[PDB]
Structure 1
């Protein structure tokens, strides 16, 4: 076997482990013909070699169809080898998005074929890549080969290829610094601001620089004129768009169908603004079977029709211009949903997106807006390496009131206010000092761990009082219920004294939405008030009416 021009990568097994020894699957006769047709061809090209009984290792093998081609792809079920092979550090840190591309004069896209088969494997490691090819007869022993080049299906093949490919491109990039080469697996995006004449010279220079190491750049996959098909997009000299997205039109929807639909919608939300998957993801909660049929809710059918109407119109993004500033604008879309657009000139979106996580049982719009800005900032530094200026639907004074009074450290980068309703605002403000002339409520609640029963009430300075029996509750729910009673039976200005750190810790965060219905009712009563002052006193210390109300709700 001749020596490949590329340097091999030394690969070891994990210490104290031997190679794989697993039996071959029964294969269909149509896949057997495709395998023997490829195994005999790769053997002629010096990519796999015959082995005898001295190789005690074996692993299954199969084949799947290639997309839009009569050719087949050979894959190895290395699930047992991957367990005992050494761990690798993947060098593919992420995804190349077209929104980060800069406008270049000339663009060239090319894809090398059978790239895993053009990079050699470590010599001492080839013995463990032994597999059997079953013949058309089950009694025929079969031909046993071993890989001399990156096997498709091994957990180290992509990590080794991506690092070996970058080492080959370094001498060309070092000699040609002004050439931009986007390297993702076996696809090379080559662009330059050089004249269209000197561009193809460097293109052929690279196709020969890659040819010196056994990498073939076929003219079939060669692309010289726009639109270029790169990473599943359509690149034009001025705009870009995703390749056509097709959503299923099932009359009977299963869980699998919904999952596929949501995934395609997430893919589309990158340029298609306004995609909502809230009500469709509400169909995936609490479900157990992937093939279980689920009927669409009225809120889910409306959300699907809206997303179908958005996908009808053609949308397109632009390319990054490093000369002008980066701008990101957010809108509140739905309760828990957010959308954003990143651009440099108005209505010329570089890319869009959405954020909708529900973090915590209790939260407000200001918290969710801060989470979205952080999700955008990280996404922007990935693609453009800088923090964009923000246009947020929150008043400058609204945010100033929030972060200065909040006990946690919170901050938003350079941003300006945009008057696009709905505007994010704080729905109620807790007073810092007790209200003069306002009725003072001393509240407390208690329950029994066994009976799940308890009381909740209050005692005021004007003699007002109330105690309510509660069934199937906890100690925390009663102390919240005692506050809800004080808010119901009080005027517009009220002072409330509690001893529950749990209840006080939720309300002071100024939430406007909650997973608990009791909290939402407390929020609703807080919005109706004009002045509300909360205060905490230690329980069981004989403090004011807090000890009087602790004894009333004792049982």
Structure 2
């Protein structure tokens, strides 16, 4: 086992990302962990002649765990892990009855990193009140959270899963970052038996918002839903015309002509108004369209996925995934505080996206940057981190998605 030479582009430099402040208990968690890793040879202390930095966090059970945010290094290294050593994503995975996610990131710690690449994996454990300069380390082995790690390890992963695949030709296994995604159509007891079997295979090489399993063949579109009403006021038809006007941008065939005819000229909002036959047909034909997926929108692998989320109240959140604005590839919903709920939704939506497209979306998050950045690791459980930015939800888009 000797190293694969890793490269950046000719003209991109390594990451120089600031460390976020950490609480005392996480700082202490991180020095326990990192003291161990150094003893084991996985990381080494470094000097100031390494100008790179990547942020580090502590997450959870009761067991603390190190999470390195390699988002910048991943971007800066995309030619290597995507074009040079890309792992092809299987279209059948989303079709399976059950998909189980297994953590396999312990595998990487046994495989040494190209010594000329090690510097770019620099990180810092900070100090309370800037007492000490705080502890700088770099990786000597394939790090968890870097997309180059599975890229490099896929040759060995393929050996490991070979008998199991051979013996189970209708089970699909996909590696994304530090996890294996394992799908079958088996009944759930047999499915779980095969997961235990796979764990034993992996164990012979030293190894191991969601629920127990994912169930992607049962994943749906959240239809833009038009109300059924006893009685229709002017306000109600206005709201309806608004929804339908905005759905007409996404779906070929939406129509509102008939409903707008109802709204004559300067009525009271409370005024009940009769529902015509043409209006009712248009309404019914719209409903059928909204049951179906969007005609004309397809996943383009050369484009970034983006995810928008709306806070709907009462622990309810809605979301849309698209590549061109409002051309939805998927839509859905998620249901004790706002930041915790939001992080759970982000992780749920990311997992779905990995299973469907083999990549993560960039999130548009309806929250203050500083609040999110203070609190997210407090509830984060995943071993990846998606790209996000911070957004003001237009108040109407929330209305149209329930």
Task: Give the alignment's TM-score, normalised by structure 2.
Answer: 0.42
What is the CA distance between 1:145 and its match in structure 2? 1.3
The 8 Å contact of residues 241 and 256 in structure 2, kept in 1 or not, is answered as yes
Q: Please list every run of 5 or more consecutive structure 2 residues that lacks an aligned counterpart in the other structure.
A: none
The 8 Å contact of residues 92 and 162 in structure 1, kept in 2 or not, is answered as no
Relative distance call for 1:307 and 1:367 in structure 2 (3 A) is farther
Relative distance call for 1:298 and 1:79 in structure 2 (3 A) is farther
What is the CA distance between 1:144 and its match in structure 2? 1.9
Distance of 2:23 and 2:369 partners within structure 1: 68
The 8 Å contact of residues 58 and 131 in structure 1, kept in 2 or not, is answered as yes
What is the CA distance between 1:11 and its match in structure 2? 0.8
The 8 Å contact of residues 48 and 148 in structure 1, kept in 2 or not, is answered as yes
Distance of 1:35 and 1:297 partners within structure 2: 67
Distance of 1:427 and 1:137 partners within structure 2: 48
Relative distance call for 1:74 and 1:310 in structure 2 (3 A) is farther
- Which residue number corresponds to residue 198 of structure 2? 206
Task: Give the alignment's TM-score, normalised by structure 1.
Answer: 0.33
Alignment root-mean-square deviation, CA: 19.4
The 8 Å contact of residues 116 and 150 in structure 1, kept in 2 or not, is answered as yes
Distance of 1:327 and 1:18 partners within structure 2: 26
Deviates more, 1:238-247 or 1:70-79: 238-247
Deviates more, 1:366-375 or 1:236-245: 366-375
Larger helix fraction of residues: 2
The 8 Å contact of residues 5 and 114 in structure 2, kept in 1 or not, is answered as yes
Distance of 2:17 and 2:143 partners within structure 1: 17
The 8 Å contact of residues 243 and 400 in structure 2, kept in 1 or not, is answered as no
Distance of 1:54 and 1:420 partners within structure 2: 44
1:154-181 deviation digits (Å, cap 9, x = unpaired): 4534644667644542454246545543
1:429-482 deviation digits (Å, cap 9, x = unpaired): 9xxxxxxxxxxxxxxxxxxxxxxxxxxxxxxxxxxxxxxxxxxxxxxxxxxxxx
What is the CA distance between 1:140 and its match in structure 2? 1.4
What is the CA distance between 1:325 and its match in structure 2? 33
Deviates more, 1:239-248 or 1:45-54: 239-248
Number of residue pairs the alignment of both structures matches: 399
- Which residue number corresponds to residue 49 of structure 1? 44
2:88 to 96, 106, 114: 96
The 8 Å contact of residues 52 and 144 in structure 1, kept in 2 or not, is answered as yes
The 8 Å contact of residues 106 and 191 in structure 1, kept in 2 or not, is answered as yes
Relative distance call for 1:140 and 1:272 in structure 2 (3 A) is same
Distance of 2:202 and 2:4 partners within structure 1: 19
Distance of 1:371 and 1:256 partners within structure 2: 35
- Which residue number corresponds to residue 183 of structure 2? 191
Distance of 2:129 and 2:122 partners within structure 1: 21
The 8 Å contact of residues 61 and 131 in structure 1, kept in 2 or not, is answered as yes
The 8 Å contact of residues 27 and 126 in structure 2, kept in 1 or not, is answered as yes
The 8 Å contact of residues 341 and 352 in structure 1, kept in 2 or not, is answered as yes
1:261-285 deviation digits (Å, cap 9, x = unpaired): 9999999999999999999999999
What is the CA distance between 1:121 and its match in structure 2? 3.0
3-state SS of 1:235 partner: coil
3-state SS of 2:311 partner: strand
The 8 Å contact of residues 46 and 137 in structure 2, kept in 1 or not, is answered as yes
Distance of 2:26 and 2:366 partners within structure 1: 58
Relative distance call for 1:242 and 1:157 in structure 2 (3 A) is farther
1:335-355 deviation digits (Å, cap 9, x = unpaired): 999999999999999999999
Relative distance call for 1:340 and 1:211 in structure 2 (3 A) is closer
Distance of 1:133 and 1:396 partners within structure 2: 22
Distance of 1:344 and 1:45 partners within structure 2: 44
3-state SS of 2:130 partner: coil
Distance of 1:108 and 1:162 partners within structure 2: 19
Matches within 5 A, 1:338-349: none
Deviates more, 1:122-131 or 1:300-309: 300-309
Deviates more, 1:285-294 or 1:119-128: 285-294
The 8 Å contact of residues 343 and 350 in structure 1, kept in 2 or not, is answered as yes
Distance of 2:28 and 2:344 partners within structure 1: 55
Q: Which of these two proteins has the greater Rg computed from alpha carbons?
A: 1
What is the CA distance between 1:382 and its match in structure 2? 12
Distance of 2:48 and 2:369 partners within structure 1: 77
Relative distance call for 1:407 and 1:89 in structure 2 (3 A) is closer
1:161-214 deviation digits (Å, cap 9, x = unpaired): 667644542454246545543555555455668999998886555323312333
